[PDB]
Amino acid sequence: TYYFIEITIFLAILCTIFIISAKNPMVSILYMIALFVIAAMYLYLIGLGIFSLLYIMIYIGAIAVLFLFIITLLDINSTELSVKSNIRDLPLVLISLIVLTISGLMIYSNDSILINKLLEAFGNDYNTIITQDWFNIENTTLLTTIGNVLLTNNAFILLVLAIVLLLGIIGPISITMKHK
Amino acid sequence: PREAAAHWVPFEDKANMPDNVPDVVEVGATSAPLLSASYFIGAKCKPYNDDFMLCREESQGSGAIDCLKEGRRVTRCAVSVIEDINKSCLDEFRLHWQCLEQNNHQLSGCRKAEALLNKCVFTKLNLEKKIPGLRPDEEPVFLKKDPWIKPAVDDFKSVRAYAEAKKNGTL
Amino acid sequence: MLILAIISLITFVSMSKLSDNRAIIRLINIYLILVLVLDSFLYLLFLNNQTYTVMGELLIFNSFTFYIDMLIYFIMIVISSLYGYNLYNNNLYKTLFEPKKELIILFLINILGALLIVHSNDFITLFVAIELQSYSIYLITAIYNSSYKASKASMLYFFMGGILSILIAYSINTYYSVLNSYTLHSLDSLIINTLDLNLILIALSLGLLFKIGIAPLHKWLISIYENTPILITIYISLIPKISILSYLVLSNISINSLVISILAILTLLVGSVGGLLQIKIKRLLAFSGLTNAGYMMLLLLLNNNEFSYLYYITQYSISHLAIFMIIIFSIYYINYINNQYNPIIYVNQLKGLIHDNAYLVLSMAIVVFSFIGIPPLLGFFGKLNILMSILNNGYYFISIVLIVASLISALYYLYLLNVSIQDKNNILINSNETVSSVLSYILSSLIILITFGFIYNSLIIDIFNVYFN
Amino acid sequence: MFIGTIILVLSFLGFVFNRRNIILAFICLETMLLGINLILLRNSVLFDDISGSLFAIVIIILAGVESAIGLSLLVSYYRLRGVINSYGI
Amino acid sequence: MNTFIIFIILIPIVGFALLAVNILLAVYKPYNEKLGTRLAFNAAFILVAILFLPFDLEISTLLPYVMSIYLVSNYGFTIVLLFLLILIIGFVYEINTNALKINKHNKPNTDSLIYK
Amino acid sequence: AIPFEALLPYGIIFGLLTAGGGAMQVLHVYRNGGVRDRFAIDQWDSQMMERDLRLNGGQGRKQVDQATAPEAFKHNHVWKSERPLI
Amino acid sequence: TAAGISLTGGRNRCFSEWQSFMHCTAKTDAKSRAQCLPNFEDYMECLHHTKEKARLREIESVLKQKKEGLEAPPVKVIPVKAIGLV
Amino acid sequence: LWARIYLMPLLQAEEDRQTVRRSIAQLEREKEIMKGTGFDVDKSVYNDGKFHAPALMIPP
Amino acid sequence: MIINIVEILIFLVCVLFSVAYLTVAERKTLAYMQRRLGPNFVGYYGLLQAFADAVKLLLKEIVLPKESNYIILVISPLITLITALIGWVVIPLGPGITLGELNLGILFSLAIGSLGVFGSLLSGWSSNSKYSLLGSIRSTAQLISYELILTSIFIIIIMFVSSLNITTIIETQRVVWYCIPLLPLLLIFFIASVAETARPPFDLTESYSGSPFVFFFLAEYSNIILISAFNGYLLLGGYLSFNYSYLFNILFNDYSYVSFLFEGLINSSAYAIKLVFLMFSFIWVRAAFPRFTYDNLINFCWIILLPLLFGIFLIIPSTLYIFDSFPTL
Ligand SMILES: CCCCC/C=C/C/C=C/CCCCCCCC(=O)O[C@H](COC(=O)CCCCCCCCCCCCCCC)COP(=O)(O)OCC[N+](C)(C)C
């Protein structure tokens, strides 16, 4: 049970390709819900069990529900993935795939050197040593510290965020009412 | 400080202390005896423990190696407290931490055994259980009569010993 | 005190009827005036470039940012006067210049999000404020929803703002992955030498800059500015420009960058020669904004660029504001009103404007020659003080490209003049109803600033010398 | 960093070469935000701090609000045109 | 290897088994008679699920606070008070505007009977 | 009055959940070795449980109380080596 | 801010190197910053472990080519079932 | 809470001695690995002279 | 490994029997409320009738219409079956007796309850008819609208415990239950629980064959007992009846397997008697009341219950503030 992270990486690739090539618009949206589940798997896998259920609650249970709710009672035309339509795209898809992929891998590195910048992204092989220290006396888990720092050090960010939630109330109402 | 996830595998080390540092014998008490005698370890070994953590504060970052000589003495003084409490109060110390291994190691559920243990240790080992930072006009929690938080089931050996200490006049 | 206005306002607007909207805006207009007048004495806090950080190194308040918030309030007073006052009392201008119920809500929320960018110190304050102002521009674009062009423009602006917000988020977390930090106060003159922060900080600046309309990605914004109605587009052209550029000028993370110099050369080129053969007045008017944002991308390369910036900002703001208000006024004299949201489109529709209200053409000529940079007017000293910073700091090819770009851009500025001073067959003699006293006084104030504002240059340089040094 | 980088890149290119409908563009936007989340939360775990977790919990809320705003924007796009084209807006 | 994951994998085994039992067990035998544009909708239908999400995002924003409630005592309390009241003001916007109503288009036609 | 037939399927629901809870409690106590479960475990108490598994010798929560620790206790100490996190 | 706050609310893993670098940067003005280059280096490889990855690759390159391998007090791996077995 | 901080230095001295022993063991181990080949294993990669536990071991 | 799989198939046999007999119980008490007998035709006193119905409906013809996604239409039953059943882990039948003791149990119980909306909405896209869509729209709109106030009541209750562990809440409720101070919240939570299953007090959209029917059927009553379990742990006492320390000091003398057996019997008998009274009240409110228009329902949730809930958000931390009573982790 070593290669779990590699498996989630591969399954996420495959799920995005099934997102962007799908018969029916909501077959594509169910593949997105599956990608959210693969994400939450990776987040529990890395050690963040809190966030995975936050993803399942907020992204799956509200955003995907809103999205499916939109696709139901609105009319959306769709062409399917013809080969006549989209292999005119493929040479720039290949060039931009390799370039954007390498370039996203580039900025984790500090060299003057171009491909020493690149292959330090693959210098991964060393197993981190986890030590126990007995300095912490209480059950401050991660949600507790998020609640301490949203509320003391970044209280202003929480209140500007309240203004953003207010805007998310006012705006959709203001569009779709047709006042008398 | 962070905990291991995503396929940690445990490993241990076939080695020894170097000759530079002397032998120190270890604490062999587990969590219920350690939690039982925590306040008496803290009552006797307060200046030793505080000199050890003051060492760790004073020479920052060196840490481990420059504070070994007092990490020796905190372990030895706690071992002294634990064998002291064994040879005087073995049966009710055992009564206490055998209560404590049920009830999620909650100190809230073992009041009638800890009254017996505090009385023995205070008259024979002459160490008192105190909670600091508690100003007056505030009652300590393990002294109060009819607390709101009672355990599910009181242990049978400790309520029997508590009643027999009532009728002996021990307590 | 914006927060007070929003909190008061949506409470008050939910209970008003739609008959009261215009009067509500008048109330807010006067409110903002007394926030300028009764509360600007806070400039005394910022003596000798004393800088504060507020909310735990979260917001940064210096005198630069104080000037920027004063400028944003002045412009909001002008724009809210344009919504809250009638042009004429016809049954025509009531069906043309009509505010929605929730328009001033979104205005004040956007002014809030625009202030929390310039006043920002950390990256999550920057992010949250960028999305606050971005959602507000989405909804200000989409609020006149009985219009095909504005609906299509709001959808386009949603997707093109979403990409360039995810690029900012990628750059921020990419900066976090190499430095356990959020501040650019972390940088402090030594880290930049021993660390390659070039790709990070330049990708940050680029993701911030493509929302202004810099040159490879300019056409989508020109289409949004042509498709929105004429009152909305004077606000959404100005406010993200001055907020995002006032962030990127205060934070000097692209000093002597080759990419920003490439895109500044390209911006000056494609804005000058892009709007030459164009026949719509908002198109013509938006490529002017493209060039004048290029002149700011120039100052992004600079260290210590706060005079040239702030002068050319209030220059461009007054000139921009006045040239949109003049073509609001020319709608009374055109022979053809289409398109209720956008009643004047083609620039040949103002053709006989010297024979009907010649002093509107005097107004127009003044602000157009200040766009060109003619020395008695205020735009000249803006271009002059930009050149004094470009040449001081070694950008010699950039200087000649600036000069050629201004010469090419003078053609389509003067095309407005060339159309308006011309013969027309049927001229006005006698018109019964009058333009708004309150609202033509604003245009005259904006002209008198442009023409007679060179008087106060030495006063302004001395007050500059004390509060920023 | 690999999973967040590749979901962001593949999500971006699926957004760019979308010619088939409009809601693929919405869901590619949301999966881009997911990939940004993945990269940041990994960095927070590796650096032993909450501040990446702070920016991640804030960008969750901002992604939700942008979905609500933009889908009301699509509904108003649809009000006057009772059809959504396949080629795009 | 806990008793948590046998559940996660075993509930599908339950389902896969039962719909197998029916598909394996019952008659198919269909035919034509057994087998077998777009409508418009009111604004409150789409409105309930669009405005649902900003309240849901607030409810899970309280979730970091109510776990940290002891540590931020007297201070995070007031920050949360201000947060809640800022969102209560947008809610009183929403119910003052009568947004979520679907209201009936035909009245008793109140207008009176006048003559000549 | 009271229909016994109406409340008998409630009686079987009650009996099934009662017998399930009782059988499950005895299964938990048999797993622990005669004591109750720990229903809320800290990071501190997680580290304390692994330390006591190290000290007692093999057994789960045998809970030795000894004066001074054994000989193999100084040598059976564990670090955890976690994989690259790709 | 949340400058040095960890997941448990304590100080993060590289807090002490960062606080040493800030102790450096507090008592220095510019023109004199070239001397606190080592502290910053100590911070950066605290973050990313670049020099330790280089060093461990240099030592693993040598232990791969030995027929002898390891003549040392070795390290044992256990299953999680057997932390304190013997 | 006061019980746990009475217990803290007692276990901290423990894990400190375990850290010192296993780190000096690993140091001597890679010294016994790279005998012959001229290479400094005692040298820290950190520029400060403070002691540090090693990390990032090769998987077994 | 023998231990945990025998434990989990004991838990599965208990809960999947008890969701079957809940059906037999609702028919019988609906009958006696209407002054007639329930079923007595199929068992000795009417029992194993849910078995008779399941035996017959696993013999029933499945019709996949002209209009339909076939795959979507038969795995929407399973995704609603599986997430209506997955939430049965975290409920305790005693202190620490769950199928998985995780310290974030309410976050899990709250995340699984939001996964249950899809098999309504998604299965509207099955058999795409213009009336087969907007009925699912009204269904999912009501569903999300009432899980809002469900989540709200949860977060109000966690203001007293400050822990997302579930048996920690029940051990916290030993001093007093949470219905006794917050009895309006018991009324609000009961009606939100009735709405969240779309019970026929709060039903509008009612007003397949075989496997897609029996999966929806089992998911309905598993949701019944699951939200009843949520009510039982965070609002009533979970497994708590009385002290029972004095009775044990009379009866027993030391810890034996019969004493743990007796204690588990008492704890899960208390939990089951809460749950059984709650399911009786579900059927009892089904018997007595007509149904709702969609507008009465949306007006009810968004205009009546939610402002009152905002008032509760303000009032309860303020009284935890006035007396310096903040709960510690
Ligand atoms: C009761 C008064 C209430 C407050 C009124 C404030 C309104 C804000 C309006 C902004 C747009 C209108 C232009 C006004 C320019 C003001 C110049 C100035 O003074 O800005 C200063 C220099 O600006 C700089 O570097 C560069 C600034 C460049 C200015 C270039 C335009 C020149 C011509 C127009 C300005 C002169 C008009 C004077 C007409 C009598 C920098 O900030 P300060 O802390 O010293 O501000 C103090 C102003 N107080 C005292 C009125 C608050």
**Chain F CB contacts of I94 below 8 Å:** 21, 24-25
Exposed / middle / buried, residue G77 (Cβ in 10 Å: 0-12, 13-18, 19+):
exposed
Measured between alpha carbons, how far is A174 from B8 in angstroms, rounded to an integer?
Answer: 53
Alpha carbon separation from D58 to A60, A158, B19, D35 (Å, rounded): 17, 9, 54, 15
User: Can you tell me whether residue F68 is helix, strand or coil?
Assistant: strand
DSSP β-bridge partners for residue B27: F68
Measured between alpha carbons, how far is G38 from G43 in angstroms, rounded to an integer?
Answer: 9
Short-list C443, C361, C416, C396, CA closest to C85: C443
CB D4 within 8 A of CB D35: yes
Measured between alpha carbons, how far is C1 from A162 in angstroms, rounded to an integer?
Answer: 16
Give one DSSP letter per residue of I222-254, joined into a string. HHHHHHHHHHHHHTS-SS-----SHHHHHH-SS
Measured between alpha carbons, how far is C137 from C106 in angstroms, rounded to an integer?
Answer: 8
Compute φ and ψ for B28, nearest 5 degrees.
-105, 15
Quote the ligand 1 centre to C34 CA distance (angstroms).
16
**Chain D CB contacts of F83 below 8 Å:** none
Alpha carbon separation from C299 to C245, C262, C392, E27, E30 (Å, rounded): 10, 13, 12, 79, 76
CB I137 within 8 A of CB I214: no
DSSP β-bridge partners for residue A129: F81
Short-list I294, I303, I312, CA closest to I136: I294
CA angle A72, A77, A82 (to 5 degrees): 125
CB B104 within 8 A of CB F61: no
On whether any CB of chain H is under 8 Å from the CB of G53, the answer is yes
Contacts of D88 by beta carbon, 8 Å cutoff, 6+ apart: D18, D19, D22
Parallel, antiparallel or unpaired: strands F79-82 and A128-130: antiparallel
Locus of tokens 């396929």: B7
CB A29 within 8 A of CB D27: yes
CB C177 within 8 A of CB C158: no
F-interface mutation test, from I35, I93, I225, most F Cβ less than 10 A away: I93
Give one DSSP letter per residue of B13-82, joined into a string. E-----TTSPP-PPEEE-HHHHHHSHHHHHHHSHHHHHHHHHHHHHSTTTTTGGGHHHHHHHHHHHHHHH
Alpha carbon separation from C47 to C43, C70, C313, C464 (Å, rounded): 8, 17, 22, 10
| Closest-CA distance of chain G to residue F71, Å | 11
Angle between the C378-392 and C281-300 helix axes, to the nearest 10 degrees? 30
Resolution of the coordinates in A?
Answer: 3.0
Residue I293: DSSP 8-state? -
Determine, for residues D67 and E53 on separate chains, whether the beta-carbon distance falls below 8 Å: yes
Measured between alpha carbons, how far is E101 from I177 in angstroms, rounded to an integer?
Answer: 38
Measured between alpha carbons, how far is H17 from B72 in angstroms, rounded to an integer?
Answer: 9
**Residue F36, Cα to own-chain centre: how many angstroms?**
7
Identity of the residue numbered F72: A
On whether any CB of chain C is under 8 Å from the CB of G78, the answer is no
Contacts of A113 by beta carbon, 8 Å cutoff, 6+ apart: none
Measured between alpha carbons, how far is A25 from A81 in angstroms, rounded to an integer?
Answer: 12
Locus of tokens 């001295």: H13
Determine, for residues G1 and C182 on separate chains, whether the beta-carbon distance falls below 8 Å: yes
Identity of the residue numbered C167: L
On whether any CB of chain I is under 8 Å from the CB of E106, the answer is no
Compute φ and ψ for C346, nearest 5 degrees.
-85, 140
CB A76 within 8 A of CB D21: yes
CA angle G34, G39, G45 (to 5 degrees): 120
Q: Each residue of I3-34: b (16+ CB within 10 Å) or e?
A: ebeebbeebbebbbbbbbbbbbbbbbbbbbee
Alpha carbon separation from B11 to A127, F76, G79, H32, H59 (Å, rounded): 12, 9, 9, 20, 10
Quote the ligand 1 centre to C129 CA distance (angstroms).
26
Compute φ and ψ for I259, nearest 5 degrees.
-75, -40
Q: Domain range holding E32?
A: 1-116
H/E element holding E56? helix E52-59
H/E element holding F67? strand F65-68
Measured between alpha carbons, how far is B89 from B91 in angstroms, rounded to an integer?
Answer: 6
Distance from the first to the final alpha carbon of chain D: 34
SS (H, E, C) chain C: CHHHHHHHHHHHHHHCCCCCHHHHHHHHHHHHHHHHHCCHHHHHHCHHHCCEEECCCCEEECHHHHHHHHHHHHHHHHHHHHHHCCCCCCCHHHHHCCCCCCHHHHHHHHHHHHHHHHCECCHHHHHHHHHHHHHHHHHHHHCCCCCHHHHHHHHHHHHHHHHHHHHHHHHHHHHHHHCCCCCCCCCCCCHHHHCCCHHHHHHHHHHHHCCCCCHHHCHHHHHHHHHCCCCCHHHHCCHHHHHHHHHHHHCCCCCCCHHHHHHHHHHHHHHHCCCCCCCEHHHHHHHHHHHHHHHHHHHHCCCCCHHHHHHHHHHHHHHHHHHHHHHHHHHHHCCCCCCCCCCCCEHHHHCCCCCCCHHHHHHHHHHHHHHHCCCCCHHHHHHHHHHHHHHHCCCHHHHHHHHHHHHHHHHHHHHHHHHHCCCCCCCCCCCCCCCCHHHHHHHHHHHHHHHCCCCCHHHHHHHHHHHCC
**Chain F CB contacts of G82 below 8 Å:** 58
CB G57 within 8 A of CB A123: yes
Q: Hey, whose CA ends up nearest to atom 13 of ligand 1? A: C314
Give partners of D (≥3 CB pairs < 8 A).
A, B, C, E, F, G
**Residue C214, Cα to own-chain centre: how many angstroms?**
14
User: Can you tell me whether residue F80 is helix, strand or coil?
Assistant: strand
* Residue A147: closest C-alpha in chain I: I162
Measured between alpha carbons, how far is B54 from B47 in angstroms, rounded to an integer?
Answer: 10
Indicate if ligand 1 lies below 6 Å from the C-beta of C63: yes
CB I223 within 8 A of CB I80: no
Determine, for residues E54 and D57 on separate chains, whether the beta-carbon distance falls below 8 Å: no
Measured between alpha carbons, how far is C143 from B70 in angstroms, rounded to an integer?
Answer: 72
Alpha carbon separation from C72 to C119, C234, C300, C452 (Å, rounded): 12, 13, 21, 22
Measured between alpha carbons, how far is C317 from C292 in angstroms, rounded to an integer?
Answer: 11
Determine, for residues B1 and A2 on separate chains, whether the beta-carbon distance falls below 8 Å: no
Identity of the residue numbered A48: L
Determine, for residues E3 and I7 on separate chains, whether the beta-carbon distance falls below 8 Å: yes
Contacts of I327 by beta carbon, 8 Å cutoff, 6+ apart: E69, E70, I159, I160, I161, I162, I320
Number of independent structural domains in chain I:
1
Short-list B4, I101, B2, CA closest to D53: B2
Locus of tokens 């006048």: E114
CB E90 within 8 A of CB A169: yes
User: Can you tell me whether residue B170 is helix, strand or coil?
Assistant: coil
Measured between alpha carbons, how far is F21 from I239 in angstroms, rounded to an integer?
Answer: 10
DSSP β-bridge partners for residue C61: C52
Indicate if ligand 1 lies below 6 Å from the C-beta of C74: yes
Compute φ and ψ for F82, nearest 5 degrees.
-95, 140
CB D57 within 8 A of CB A146: yes
Measured between alpha carbons, how far is A29 from A35 in angstroms, rounded to an integer?
Answer: 10
Short-list B157, B154, B80, B84, CA closest to B125: B84
Exposed / middle / buried, residue I62 (Cβ in 10 Å: 0-12, 13-18, 19+):
buried
Short-list C277, C443, C247, C284, CA closest to C360: C443
Structure tokens at B54: 């003051």
3-state helix, strand, coil in chain E (%, to 5): 55, 0, 45
Question: What are the residue ranges spanned by the domains of chain G?
Answer: 1-86
Indicate if ligand 1 lies below 6 Å from the C-beta of C456: yes
Question: What are the residue ranges spanned by the domains of chain B?
Answer: 1-171
Locus of tokens 């309860």: I316
CB I158 within 8 A of CB E66: yes
Structure tokens at A53: 């259920």
On whether any CB of chain B is under 8 Å from the CB of A46, the answer is yes
Measured between alpha carbons, how far is F42 from B35 in angstroms, rounded to an integer?
Answer: 15
CA angle I24, I28, I31 (to 5 degrees): 145
3-state helix, strand, coil in chain I (%, to 5): 65, 0, 35
H/E element holding D80? helix D51-80
**Residue E26, Cα to own-chain centre: how many angstroms?**
37
Short-list E56, C203, C17, CA closest to I146: E56
CB C125 within 8 A of CB C116: yes
Exposed / middle / buried, residue A78 (Cβ in 10 Å: 0-12, 13-18, 19+):
middle
CA atoms within 13 A on the CB side of D31: 37
Exposed / middle / buried, residue I41 (Cβ in 10 Å: 0-12, 13-18, 19+):
exposed
Residue F35: DSSP 8-state? S
Structure tokens at C46: 């910022």
Measured between alpha carbons, how far is C58 from C69 in angstroms, rounded to an integer?
Answer: 17
**Residues in chain I, total:** 329
Quote the ligand 1 centre to A156 CA distance (angstroms).
30
Indicate if ligand 1 lies below 6 Å from the C-beta of C36: yes
Measured between alpha carbons, how far is A94 from A90 in angstroms, rounded to an integer?
Answer: 6
Angle between the I2-33 and I49-57 helix axes, to the nearest 10 degrees? 100
Short-list I88, I258, I238, I261, CA closest to I166: I238
Identity of the residue numbered A3: Y
Locus of tokens 């181990």: H29
Measured between alpha carbons, how far is F71 from F60 in angstroms, rounded to an integer?
Answer: 20
Compute φ and ψ for B12, nearest 5 degrees.
-130, 175
Residue E66: DSSP 8-state? T
Distance from the first to the final alpha carbon of chain A: 63
Measured between alpha carbons, how far is H5 from G77 in angstroms, rounded to an integer?
Answer: 32
Alpha carbon separation from D86 to A76, D22, D23 (Å, rounded): 7, 7, 10
Indicate if ligand 1 lies below 6 Å from the C-beta of C452: no
Alpha-carbon radius of gyration of chain C: 22
**Residue C43, Cα to own-chain centre: how many angstroms?**
23
Number of independent structural domains in chain E:
1
